[PDB]
Design a protein around this motif. Sequence first.
Motif, PDB file in Angstrom:
ATOM      1  N   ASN A 113       0.752  -1.349  -0.040  1.00  8.58           N
ATOM      2  CA  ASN A 113      -0.138  -0.182   0.165  1.00  8.58           C
ATOM      3  C   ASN A 113       0.917   1.172  -0.021  1.00  8.58           C
ATOM      4  N   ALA A 114       1.999   1.230   0.802  1.00  3.92           N
ATOM      5  CA  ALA A 114       2.744   2.286   0.588  1.00  3.92           C
ATOM      6  C   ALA A 114       3.451   2.768  -0.689  1.00  3.92           C
ATOM      7  N   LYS A 163       2.148   1.644  -3.461  1.00  5.50           N
ATOM      8  CA  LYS A 163       0.977   2.162  -4.277  1.00  5.50           C
ATOM      9  C   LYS A 163       0.466   3.738  -4.138  1.00  5.50           C
ATOM     10  N   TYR A 164       0.719   4.282  -2.699  1.00 10.77           N
ATOM     11  CA  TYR A 164       0.271   5.669  -2.530  1.00 10.77           C
ATOM     12  C   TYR A 164       1.396   6.370  -2.953  1.00 10.77           C
ATOM     13  N   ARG A 165       2.730   6.163  -2.847  1.00 14.43           N
ATOM     14  CA  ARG A 165       3.872   7.167  -3.293  1.00 14.43           C
ATOM     15  C   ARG A 165       4.387   6.615  -4.760  1.00 14.43           C
ATOM     16  N   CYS A 183       3.879   8.145  -7.366  1.00  9.01           N
ATOM     17  CA  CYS A 183       4.131   9.612  -8.499  1.00  9.01           C
ATOM     18  C   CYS A 183       5.483   9.981  -8.177  1.00  9.01           C
TER      19      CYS A 183
END
Length: 308
Positions: free
Chosen positions: A300-301, A303-305, A307
């Motif tokens: 999840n980490a 997937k969130y970062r 970009c």
Amino acid sequence: ELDTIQRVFQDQKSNPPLVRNMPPEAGKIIWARHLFQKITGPINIFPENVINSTEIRRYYGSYNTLGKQLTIYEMWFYQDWVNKIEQSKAALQATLIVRHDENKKLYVNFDLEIMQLIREAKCLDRQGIEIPESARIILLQEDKFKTYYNELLYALKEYERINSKIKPICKNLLLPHIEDLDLKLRPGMVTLTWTSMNIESYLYYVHQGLKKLEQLIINVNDIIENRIENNLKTVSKVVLVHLPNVEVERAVDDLLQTIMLYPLDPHVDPVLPEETKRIKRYYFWYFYQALLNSTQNSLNAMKYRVCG
């Protein structure tokens, strides 16, 4: 015062706040004697111165006319006291005092006998009174019973601390060891503290079982609490996107390492603890859930970062 002395005696020995380590009998008679002496112173013163015136015475017465009363009260107190202990011991307290044993805690049978014989000799000695041979023989025996009761106290509670430290995890390796730590006492041994032996060796043997178990827990800890926890932390830190096999191999190795600690993956047959074995698997599943969650948390980490 001495009418002032009178009001002092009228407010007898049980009525003021006596603070000391001397029985009511002894304090009462001394205070009476002291009060009489004064007359116481114042018464013485017153016366012477015153016485014358016376016033014173018245016152013374018252015182016493006062002195006569005091003497009468002393005699009544001594009537209740002189010969009382001899009768008690010879009748129901000298007849092979049952030693201290346990079922869930330590059960004291003759607590009264210990306390009574204790106060008896201290007061007779301090008051300069003769102590009968019966009282001295049972008193020495009482000291033996008190010491053994206290040592057994320490032993039982050792099992209690070990339990307080085992039950938070409910591991089915130590629960069977705990089960194996059960003993049985026949009635022929219920009178061993009489000649001062076999209880010291008995308690020492129970202690020996407890220390052996503790050593097994120490191992289980060194193997499990540190290495595997560190591995889990490594699993959580693994950045699955990018970073400039090992943990999986270590997980397999750690399983086999745990198997080497006699964990009952199959239920023990004679004992048949089918319900008890799955409990560790539930805790172990929570640990496995922490391992998969470690990788998932990382997942999840990223997937969130993504970009940056």
